[PDB]
Every structure is written in C-alpha cells, then in structure tokens.
Design a protein around this ligand. Structure first.
Ligand code: J8Y
Lengths: 129, 402, 11
C-alpha cells in the first residue's frame, strides 16, 4: 500500500497497483521515490471519487457520473493532473453527450451560457452552415 | 460545488485547451455546427482547434469511403500535416459526393471500361483480384495476366500452370494460384518469378485463401488442406480436412473459423486453431458455388439460384435472397452491399442491411441488375466506388459508380 | 456443362 496525500492533508492508503494506473503518480513513485506522494492539486473529496473509480477499473460509470457539473469539471481536472487516460476519456465523452443532438439554445441552457454574438456575427456564422 | 459550468470556456481559461478540443472532437457534424453557434468562445475553440480538419481526418481514419475520396478527389493532400474554414466548407461537398455515389449505386448509373483479354484458344477469366495499381487475373488459357488498373494494358504474363488457373490471391509479396492441373503455385508479385509449387491435391485446386502466415486450399478431390507459410519457400502441410462428400468449391477463413462449401450441398465450419469440425450449415437445395465469410456473416451462392446469409455462431440462416435466374457463381459483400454474378451473365446488387433486417420485404432487396457480360460471370470484387468482374466471355469489366 | 472452377455431387 502507498499513502496518497491530498491538498487538504488527509492521508489515503491505496494499493500500489491501483495508484500506478495514473502515470503521474507512477513517475513520482518510480523516478523520485516519494512517500507519501503529496498531491497539491487534488482535494480529498475529489481524490476519494477518483480512487473509487480506479479500484473498479459503461453502466457503472454513468451512475458514477450523476453529479453536478462543478464536480464533473473537478473530475476532468484531477484526471488530467493525474493522467488517468481512462477517466479523462469517460468524463470528456460524458460532456460531449451533453452537447450532441441539441440546438444552440439548449446547449446554452444546459450549461448556463449567455449568447454573446452580435446580430451581424451570428448571421455570418449561420450562413457558413 | 457549482451547479453548472461552461466546460468549453473554463478549460482553455485554465491553460487546458486540448481537453476542450477533445470534448468537441466527439461531436457529429451537425452538433459541431451547433457548438459553433453557442457563443463566441465556443466558436473560437472550434476554429483555433481546427475541429473541422480533425473531423474529416477522423472520418478518413474510420471509413474507407472517406479514405477513398480523400485519395481519389485529392483533398486528402491537405490532411495529416489551409485554414479551418476551408475544411468547414469542404465537409458538405463530401456529404453531397457520398450521396451522389450512393444514388449511382441505387439507380445503376455508372461508366464502364472493358478489357478484352484476347485469349488465343481457351477463352475465359476464372478469377481476379485488384488494387489501385493493377488487376491480377487468372485465365482458362493457363496463364496469369497482370493488367495496369489505369491504362488497362497487359503488363505481365505468368506462365507455368499446365491447366486453367481457377483461383488466386495476392498480397504485398506474393501471388498464390490454384489450377485445374491440381497444383498450387507461388509467384513473386513484383517480378512474376515462380517461387514454389505445392504438390498435394489429387484433383483441380478450385479455391484458396491466405493471409498472415496461413493458407487454406480446397479441391475437387473433396478435401481441404491447411498450410503454414513461414515464407514463400517454406510452406508445410499442417492438416487435411475431409468430411465433404463432393468437390469443395470455395473456402474462406479468419482467426475464429475456416468455412468450406461443396457440391454436397453443405457449408462446413472448422476451428482455425484446431482444424476440428464444428458444425454444418444446411439449407441450400443444390450445390454451393461461391461464398464469403467475415465477422459473423457467411454469404453463399448456389446452384439452386438463391443466396443465403448465415450467422456463423449459431448456424442460423438469416435470409434467403431470390431473384437470380441462373446459378450464382460468384459473390462478395462489404458493409453496405452484396454483389453476385450468375451463369446468365448478370450481376445483382443487394442491400445487405435491408437483407439482414427481417422486417424488410424480399422485393425491396435487389437494388439493381447489371447486364454487360455475354457469358457466365466467374469472379468479381468491389468497393465503395466500383465493381471489377470477369467472365467466360473473356472480358474483365470495371463498373465505376463515381 | 459446367466450368472447371466448380463441380457438383456427381461422379
Ligand atoms: O446441377 C447441379 N445439381 C442438380 C441437378 C439436377 C438434380 C439434382 C438433384 N438430385 N437429387 N436432388 N437434387 C441436382 C449442380 C451444379 C453446380 C453445383 C455447384 F458447383 F455449385 F456446386 N452444384 C450442383 O448441385
């Protein structure tokens, strides 16, 4: 087992083979020999969610990703920082599924986005479709 | 935790532009257009990210039709290392192009080139394979003729067989041929040099396939031979499969199964690894003349004038295709169509998706009948853009729907 | 008659 240290300070015991699915955590282990591994960019709440995903590794992922967009955004960032390609892939595909098959207005409404085109600019981009 | 979050704005704001581009790269065309109109920053991300270029490249990577047009039309020159808007304006032109190609297939609109093989004595072309550079063809006059795909001229005559060349396949290194003289021969695909001859079968070698170190051959002598090819000059017999009660007219295989079909009216399935019999596909009322196998799909053509589709795992016949007026002598399929040729010189185009949907009525299944041969159609190969077929009439036809 | 490429169950 290897101790992972979240930005808060809470220490988590994780099996080395789960931890080492992240190339980032593997490099800190294998090349710099750090124990524990401080992780200043991932707090405890998101870290527990990622560790949960790593142990299990989709229908399970869809249920795991039934969270607010703020948490999904934090999950994308943690997966990027830790370089867990599988989770970054599952989070990005989830965001793309929230975009596809919708009008611009439903996308705006989905994500709380203000339309900031000028009238002139919108007519031009629309003509080019 | 925030309730909502503009992923596509927030990620670049944080110096993570590539993640935002990757999210958007999963969109289909129409959703990518929608994303463009979400807001100014979304538009900038799609434009600076070259997403339309990235979208066309993903299609070319995943669809041989898109790959074929990229090469044939030349816009492929701009792909894989002209601004983003160029790719945005190109995308609909490609869509319309696909539509016109699909219409030409559905309506039978094509141009035709005809090679007269000019066989001096025994007329007819039993077999063929082609690429963008060449057509390699096997002839009843005992030769292999290699034709230039572009100029239609004869570039090489390969002699050595003492009877008709009934079957052939080639790859990047070799041509392998089977003959009425009961031998299999191996030729250098570049120089034509005869490299090996296999003496095994007691009667005409009617079909063969090989790929990635193994070959299957089958014979009028009612047997199948399984070969290991360590090299063009080191080919060893691994096993002989027997169980068919008449000539084995065709064989196909992949990593799961070997599939053979016979005058004995049956298709037999064998485990490629073990060479053990697995199952018999029954159902045709007469001998089977032709077959193709890929994935889970077996397609067979028979003397009973029908085509049958089969799933390989359970052996069920999924569909009987009626319409040919004579023996179905060759058949191929891809992801969209079946193409079959018959003893009356006619070629039929079938909608394979429709055929695999048991709701579709039979009369809607044959899209077109193509009538340009004056003798039995012995072999054909096709792709998204064309059919190449050959006949007892001593001609090779290229039917071009682009 | 048939072409040399294929054969039936005859003998
Ligand atoms: O002419 C054929 N057959 C046939 C004819 C008359 C009766 C019966 C019969 N007798 N009893 N029940 N049916 C059968 C024939 C030709 C080619 C092929 C093949 F090359 F594709 F393999 N196969 C065939 O079968």
């Amino acid at each position: 087992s290897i101790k992972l240290q979240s930005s808060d300070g809470e220490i988590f015991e994780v099996d080395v083979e789960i931890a080492k699915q992240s190339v980032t955590i593997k490099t800190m282990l294998e090349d710099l020999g750090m124990d524990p591994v401080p992780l200043p960019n991932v707090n405890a709440a998101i870290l527990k969610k990622v560790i949960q995903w790593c142990t299990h590794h989709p229908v399970w992922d869809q249920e795991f990703l039934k969270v607010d967009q703020g948490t999904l955004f934090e999950l994308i960032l943690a997966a990027n920082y830790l370089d867990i390609k599988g989770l970054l892939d599952v989070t990005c595909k989830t965001v793309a599924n929230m975009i596809k098959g919708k009008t611009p207005e439903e996308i705006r409404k989905t994500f709380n986005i203000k339309n900031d085109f000028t009238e002139e600019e919108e007519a031009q981009v629309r003509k080019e479709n | 935790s925030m309730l909502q979050r503009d992923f596509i704005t927030a990620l670049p704001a944080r110096g993570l532009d590539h993640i935002a581009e990757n999210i958007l790269s999963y969109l289909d065309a129409k959703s990518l257009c929608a994303a463009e109109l979400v807001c100014k920053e979304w538009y900038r991300v799609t434009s600076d990210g070259m997403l339309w270029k990235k979208l066309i490249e993903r299609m070319v990577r995943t669809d041989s039709l898109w790959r074929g047009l990229a090469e044939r039309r030349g816009w492929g020159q701009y792909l894989f290392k002209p601004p983003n808007s160029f790719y945005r304006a190109l995308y609909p032109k490609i869509i319309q192009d696909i539509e016109t190609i699909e219409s030409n297939w559905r309506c039978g609109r094509h141009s035709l080139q005809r090679i007269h093989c000019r066989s001096e004595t025994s007329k007819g072309v039993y077999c063929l394979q082609y690429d963008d550079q060449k057509i390699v063809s096997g002839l009843r006059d005992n030769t292999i003729k290699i034709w230039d795909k572009n100029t239609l001229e004869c570039k090489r005559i390969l002699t050595g067989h003492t009877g008709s060349v009934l079957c052939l396949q080639y790859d990047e290194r070799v041509i392998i041929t089977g003959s009425s003289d009961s031998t299999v021969r191996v030729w250098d695909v570049n120089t034509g040099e005869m490299l090996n001859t296999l003496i095994h079968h007691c009667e005409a070698v009617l079909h063969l396939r090989f790929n990635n170190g193994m070959m299957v051959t089958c014979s009028k002598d009612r047997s199948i031979a399984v070969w290991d090819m360590a090299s063009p000059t080191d080919i060893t017999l691994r096993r002989v499969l027997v169980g068919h009660r008449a000539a084995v007219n065709v064989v196909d295989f992949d990593d799961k199964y070997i599939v053979s079909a016979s005058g004995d009216r049956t298709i037999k399935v064998w485990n490629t690894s073990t060479c053990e019999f697995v199952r018999t596909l029954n159902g045709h009322k007469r001998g089977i003349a032709c077959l193709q196998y890929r994935d889970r799909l077996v397609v067979s053509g028979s003397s009973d004038n029908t085509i049958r589709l089969w799933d390989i795992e359970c052996g069920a016949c999924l569909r009987v295709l009626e319409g040919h007026e004579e023996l179905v002598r060759c058949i191929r399929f891809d992801n969209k169509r079946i193409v079959s040729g018959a003893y009356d010189g006619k070629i039929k185009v079938w909608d394979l998706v429709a055929a695999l949907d048991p709701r579709a009525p039979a009369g809607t299944l044959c899209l077109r009948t193509l009538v340009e041969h004056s003798g039995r159609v012995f072999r054909l190969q096709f792709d998204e853009f064309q059919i190449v077929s050959s006949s007892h009439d001593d001609t090779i036809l290229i039917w071009d729907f682009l | 008659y048939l072409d040399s490429g294929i054969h039936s169950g005859a003998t």
